[model samples]
Target: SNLKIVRMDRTAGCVTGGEEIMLLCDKVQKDDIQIRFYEEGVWEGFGDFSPTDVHRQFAIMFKTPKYKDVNITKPASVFVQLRRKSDLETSEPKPFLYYPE
Candidate 1:
């Protein structure tokens, strides 16, 4: 009942990943939260960011992770959500599109 994503600056990035993204959230612990990107059982990757990237505990600045299959010809769909390891709780999912290189 505590984790949530308010909005994101952008929802699409390259499948090659490594693009920066800014996300707004409902208060969270910088030390306990992670930017999780996944597609069911196909693949999963965490956004690259440090504790200091957590802006006042309500926002996060991180980079996208390269997809498992980067040799794509079109856009791929994945889900982005907040994961709180302290309690193993996750926020709602947001669609993130990964475009082909």
Candidate 2:
């Protein structure tokens, strides 16, 4: 199965967290998709927070998680990707730059 992220509302944001963003993607299963972010060094879940959209399957809203690395004071670039909960297959990573607020 081919899964892809078409685009995000923003490619960068403040690392202080809780920024609202939208992801546009190829039409895929709604509940089976999980958003994962590259934090510090490894890819991790978006935790209890997940994308939500009652109106569309191709687009959803997600909030940026708090920065994990205390050592990163400057603007740091990370990645966000889609993971299928059914088979654990992941999509290609996309750039997401976060700057300390």
Candidate 3:
């Protein structure tokens, strides 16, 4: 049997929130993954991560103000990379960073 090799992870935390925060993922996909964090059903924070290397963990640089006034005292999640060529399409979006997210 052929083995597919790919993986991904995200690490993030609140810089201004009242409490501590962190990002966690399991068996993370390698690419095309989205990480969303919410508190009390409200959109407290969100992170869309893309890693250059899928075989290791990834860190996301976030804005301090984006994490301000946000309550983070619940379980956090990390959206692993999706290992599939079909999910890596890049023909339907504009340049947001001039690089991969």
Candidate 4:
């Protein structure tokens, strides 16, 4: 609950995943960063990008992970969290919408 999420360009992405998303947060190093997209005890996914993807060490730009199940019929709701390389505990849960590809 230390690092703060400031702004996100989008709260939802395609079920196909790999969609580009940019989010700004509190101070953080690009070396060890994580934006774990997951479902509690169900499934988890990682983002795609290089260390250079982080701008000013605050904003992160990366592609969403390929969802475990992409063959959905309608939009699905999931949760995402900002993990600052274990700099602190998990941040508040953020809701993310997934649209069928």
CA deviation > 4 Å runs, candidate 3: 1-24, 56-101
| Top candidate by TM-score | 1
Poorest lDDT segment (10 consecutive residues) of candidate 4: 52-61
Residue lDDT tens for model 1, 1-101: 89998888899999999999988888899899999998963888889999898876444558889998989999999998889999979999999999988
Candidate 2 residues lying further than 4 Å off, grouped into runs, are: 39-54, 57-101
* lDDT for each candidate structure: 0.88, 0.71, 0.44, 0.83
| RMSD to native, candidate 2 | 17.5
Candidate of highest lDDT: 1
TM-score of each: 0.53, 0.43, 0.26, 0.52
lDDT tens string, model 2, 1-101? 57788777788777665777776767666678766777675756462344455136454457878879756779998999999999999999999988877
> In model 4, which regions exceed 4 Å deviation?
57-101
Task: Write model 4 residue lDDT over 1-101, tens digit each, in one string.
Answer: 66777888899988899989888887877987888888874899988888889878444569998767789998888999977775767889999999987
lDDT for 26 (candidate 4): 79
Name the candidate, 1 or 4, with the larger lDDT value. 1
Writing each residue's lDDT as its tens digit, candidate 3 over 4-59 gives 32323324445654443334445656665554556774656655434753345565
Error of 3 at 75 (Å): 38
